[PDB]
Design a protein around this ligand. Structure first.
Ligand SMILES: CCCCCCCCCCCC[N+](C)(C)[O-]
Ligand SMILES: CCCCCCCCCCCC[N+](C)(C)[O-]
Ligand SMILES: CCCCCCCCCCCC[N+](C)(C)[O-]
Lengths: 86, 78, 220, 183, 183, 222, 183, 222, 183, 24
């Protein structure tokens, strides 16, 4: 059922790319702040969380318009397929 | 001309019998009334309405119709 | 260094003629050859005066001159099969001139063409021209319409033509034009869309199409 | 000698030389390699060369194609940009096919971009095309418009002869003789 | 000798030489390896060579194919992209098959891309085809259109003879004699 | 260094004729041989004058000359089987000329063909040409229509033809054209979306009636 | 000697040689190893050789096969891609089979790719086939169309003789004598 | 080095004949052998003039010449079983010529074939030809139809044919054609689907097709 | 000697040799080990050799089998792929069985791949089969078609004699005498 | 069916068969 196959595969691909960007940013920031604590040999729990929050908020301010474009496109498309037979 | 065909006639292409026998009504000189049950049938071809009574009689037997004429209108039924 | 030695290996391709103005005239058969020759002169390989000529160019130039001194002369085309003795085709019906007048015309043409020794004037029949056109269309089996005017004939070919019909028409028309020119008979080719495919209709008198059940259309 | 233009591309330089020679101005092209080409002329001709450079708005600009606004660099590319690249490829392939017909020298084609709306949820509009072409001298233009319309009609899903525009022109006179050098 | 062009491909060089030789311009091709080919002519012929290079818009450009717009790197490419690459391959394979027919020298083929809609939600439209071809001299073109139509009709699932356009032309005269050297 | 030594190993592939022009004429069978020869001349391997000729080129050239000087002559074709003595086929019905006029025509043609010693003029029958066409179609069972004009005959073959019918038809036509030329008889081959292969009927009270030829056809509903 | 082409493959060079020899041009093939093959001709033949290289568009592009668009090794495939690889293999297998029939020299086959739509929820369309073939001289072509139609008909679940197009041609005259060397 | 020494080890495969034009004619039996010989001549292993010939090529050549000088002669085929004395089969009915004319024809043929000492002309019966054709199709049990024309007979073999039938047909026809040629009798072999594509219909002068229940189509008499 | 081809495999080399010898061309095979086989001919025969190499499109391509497109040594295999490999193995095993019949030299078999639809929710189409075979001289082909049909019919669950196509041919004349050496 | 007039049935319903017979 090429229609069910398409809609099902695209749902998962969209989950993977919508979620990837915030987690990539968070991971890279995490690594750099973890390193800096080693070369400084200076340690605390809170600095990485503090920076990660800002990094993710900026990520959302920037990309969020595109999240809307992608979701609207998919929303229309699935309805048209569901009611396509008539 | 938008009608580049030489002779005269009617070219049906998948016409309900209602819309076909209407084209014959002017040569018959009578209004035609067709039952819904007969109007479910279809026809295709190229036809000469030269002698309408003699054509109508033949097509009745080929298509399984029955017909009557009260003096004012022609009635065609299955 | 004669001019013939400079034009190439294929000596048959060109023809050199000396003119009364003491200038060499090179006769070519087509545009490609024309430019093949003109490059040699424009480069300046030859030292004396020379010119390049062809049938189409001379037809045009002569027509421009006739437009000024004989604005009502009816004629067809000038042939250069033998460039030293061109043949000029005039209408028999649409011209009334004396023999003296025709001779004078001949001499003035000869003065315009310094490479030609004389001009032969021949009278042709219009009915013949028109007939060979219409017969050529019937031969090709094209659909057509004919319209007649005091001074010309027009053949209109229009419709949803097939590729084999466009090809045949093109070949024929191009063959005719070379013989007769374009002054008396004109052809018009006009492709149009098809209204009838997939619709029922009545034809002959009182013809009409119907776009869909319940929607009649009455062309003129 | 006075410098007109510097840092030109090969195809800007040849266009400038062509346009100045046509007006009887002898020009010179010099190559500096990584610095490109330079164009120079004599003083008596400097004024005229300037006026023609202005009149033709030389040097010419790079050629524009719609695919250049929608480069393939995204992980998801929107449907609008996909359809834009599609039509921007078909136009070019049609131009290249037209230049192979008998005695055409150059051509241009344009297509109606119905993609400035997605046509999501709306029935799609029919296509329109336009074509420009240049012919060798002595060509029966009237008889050749038919061929081009016939060819373009069936290259697309639904096109009417009433919706194809064609415009033809003949080549100009050939520039064969060299310009004269100032005395 | 004056430099016309540098850094050409082999394919651009041989086209330029062919076009100049046709107009009686003797040209020279030089190879610089990593720098490509260079074309040179004499001064008496420089003006003409320039004018022709402009009129033909030489050197020629690369040849476009629709599949160049859609090279797949994704996990999931659109139903649009896959269908586009498919049609963009069938086109090329038909041109290669036609070139084998008796006495055809070259040909080109075009298909109507319905894919300018994904055909999500809407029913698919019927196909149209156009072809151009060039023949050896002395070929009965009228009699040879039938073969091509017959061959193409059955390469696709729904095609009507009415929807197939075919345009044919003959080879021009052969250029066998060499151009003359300036005196 | 004779010309025959330069054309190849297969000597009989070409034929060399001297002529009053004081130029060698090389006669070739087909276009490919024609170019094989022309290359030798155009390369400049030979020093005197020479030219390459074939039947088709000569037919075209001569017809172009006749169009200027004899614009109403009805004729078929000139055969060069024996190039020194060509045979020119005229129509018996459509031409009216005296023997003297024919002789003059012959002499003028001889002037056009400096390699030919004489031209033989033969009169052929149009009814024969038409009958050989029609019988050749019947012998192949092709479906066709015939149309008659004052000056010619047209055979129309059209519809959803089969591949074996297309093949047989194009072999026949390509054989006839070589003999009679295309002037008098024309063949049109056209593919249509129509399964009755050109027939057409109207239905009336008395049944079917055959409909005269015409451009419009009813596309196949099947 | 003038260089026409460099960096050719084996099977490009052999085609170029064959086409030049057919028109009486003596050519030479040289091997440079990692640099490929080079082709050379004499100056008197240079002009003609360039004209023929243009006219035939030599050197030939490689054969196109649809599976090249849908590699077997991508991470994922939609059904459309798999189905296209399948038909792209059946075509090649039928070609290789026909080349074994009596007196056939070479052949080409084309199949209607229905894959460009799903036919889901819908009746899948019947198949269409086209074939081209070249025969040794003296073959009764009319009698040989039947065999090929009969053979192809049963290669698929539903095919009608009406839906099979077959085009046949004979071999050209043999090129046995060597071309002459310029004087 | 004689020519026979160059053609191979199998001496009996080829036959060398001297001609009046001072040329050797190598008669061959088939295409493969023809090309085996032509390669030897074209390579230039031999140094005098020589030529390779076969029956099919010669039949074509001579037919082409007859088309020019005897455009109405009715004939079948020329047999070269004995290449020094060919046999030419003419129709007894469809030709009217005198003995003198036949002798003239003979001499002109002898001029076309410089390797032949004489041409023997034999008159054959059309009824015999036609009878052998119909007897062959009956013996092979093929279904067929016969059409008669003034100039020829045509046998149409068409419909759904089985593999065995197709094979038998091809073998027989190939056998016949080698004896009688293809001028008088033609065999049309055509694979047809079911005439109407699985649809019910009424045949006769009032015929029609049922596109579907409730849908009539009136194309033609059937 | 002139080099025709290099880096050939054993089967390609022996094919080329066979084709050339048939036309009276003496050829030589040379072995370079890891660089493969080379083929050489004399100059008087070079022209003909080139023409025949073109005409037969030598060297031959590798033989195609459907299972090559759906390799079994892959991480996961869709049902379509498995359903394809099954048929592509049955085909080969039938070819190999036919070769064992009395008097047969070689054969090819083809089966209708109904996998080109899943036929999920649908009734499966019947099977169709096609076969080609080559026999020794003096074989009664007519009487041998029956055996093949009988044998094939029971190879599959539902087959009708009407759905089986069989084409037979005889071996050509034997090439036993050696070609002559150029003088 | 070179002569006369008849009907070629293909699993036709009796209603369509006897309708075709009605004319005779
Ligand atoms: C995003 C997580 C949930 C996605 C659920 C998608 C359900 C797809 C159902 C069909 C799966 C089997 N398939 C692809 C053969 O149809
Ligand atoms: C920590 C907040 C998590 C929110 C998750 C959803 C993020 C995407 C949608 C909100 C975007 C808001 N924005 C950037 C338009 O302002
Ligand atoms: C504090 C987290 C709030 C997350 C939800 C914010 C509202 C949804 C985003 C609305 C704007 C969407 N956008 C950017 C496409 O316009």
């Amino acid at each position: 059922m090429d229609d069910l196959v398409f809609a099902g595969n695209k749902a998962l691909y969209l989950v993977l790319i919508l979620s990837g960007w915030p987690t990539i940013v968070a991971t890279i920031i995490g690594l750099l702040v973890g390193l800096f604590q080693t070369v400084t040999q200076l340690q605390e729990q809170t600095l990485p969380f503090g920076i990660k929050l800002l990094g993710v908020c900026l990520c959302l301010f920037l990309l969020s318009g595109w999240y809307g474009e992608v979701l609207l496109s998919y929303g229309r498309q699935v309805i048209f397929l569901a009611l396509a037979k008539g | 001309e938008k009608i580049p065909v030489t002779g005269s006639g009617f070219v049906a292409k998948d016409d309900s019998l209602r819309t076909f026998f209407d084209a014959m009504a002017l040569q018959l000189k009578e209004p035609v009334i067709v039952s819904k049950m007969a109007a479910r049938k279809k026809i295709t071809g190229n036809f000469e309405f030269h002698d309408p009574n003699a054509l109508l009689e033949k097509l009745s037997l080929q298509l399984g119709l029955i017909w009557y004429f009260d003096g004012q209108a022609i009635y065609i039924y299955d | 260094a004669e001019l013939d030695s400079l034009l190439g290996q294929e000596k048959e391709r060109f023809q050199v003629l000396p003119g009364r103005d003491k200038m060499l005239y090179v006769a070519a058969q087509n545009e490609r050859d024309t430019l093949w020759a003109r490059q040699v002169l424009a480069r300046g390989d030859y030292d004396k005066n020379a010119r390049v000529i062809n049938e189409n160019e001379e037809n045009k130039r002569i027509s421009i001159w006739l437009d000024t001194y004989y604005p009502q002369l009816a004629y067809y085309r000038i042939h250069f099969d033998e460039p030293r003795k061109p043949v000029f085709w005039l209408s028999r019906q649409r011209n009334t001139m004396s023999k003296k007048e025709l001779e004078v015309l001949s001499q003035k043409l000869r003065a315009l063409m310094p490479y030609a020794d004389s001009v032969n004037i021949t009278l042709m029949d219009d009915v013949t021209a028109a007939g060979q056109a219409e017969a050529g269309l019937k031969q090709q089996a094209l659909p057509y319409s004919r319209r007649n005017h005091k001074g010309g004939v027009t053949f209109v070919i229009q419709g949803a033509l097939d590729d084999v019909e466009i090809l045949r028409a093109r070949q024929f028309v191009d063959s005719y034009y070379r013989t007769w020119g374009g002054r008396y008979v004109q052809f018009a080719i006009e492709l149009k869309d098809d209204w009838l495919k997939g619709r029922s209709f009545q034809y002959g008198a009182e013809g009409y199409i119907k776009m869909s059940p319940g929607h009649w259309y009455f062309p003129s | 000698d006075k410098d007109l233009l510097k840092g030109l591309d090969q195809e800007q330089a040849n266009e400038v030389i062509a346009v100045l020679q046509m007006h009887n101005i002898e020009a010179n092209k010099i190559d500096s390699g990584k610095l490109g080409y330079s164009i120079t002329v004599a003083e008596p001709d400097f004024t005229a060369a300037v006026y023609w450079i202005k009149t033709y708005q030389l040097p010419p600009r790079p050629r524009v194609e719609i695919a250049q606004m929608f480069p393939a660099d995204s992980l998801v590319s929107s449907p609008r940009a996909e359809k834009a690249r599609l039509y921007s490829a078909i136009e070019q392939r049609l131009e290249q096919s037209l230049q192979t017909m008998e005695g055409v020298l150059s051509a241009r084609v344009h297509i109606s971009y119905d993609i400035d709306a997605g046509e999501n949820g709306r029935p799609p509009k029919p296509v329109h095309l336009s074509a420009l072409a240049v012919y060798e001298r002595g060509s029966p233009l009237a008889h050749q418009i038919s061929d081009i319309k016939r060819f373009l009609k069936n290259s697309f899903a639904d096109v009417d002869y009433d919706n194809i525009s064609v415009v033809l022109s003949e080549r100009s006179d050939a520039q064969l003789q060299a310009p004269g050098t100032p005395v």
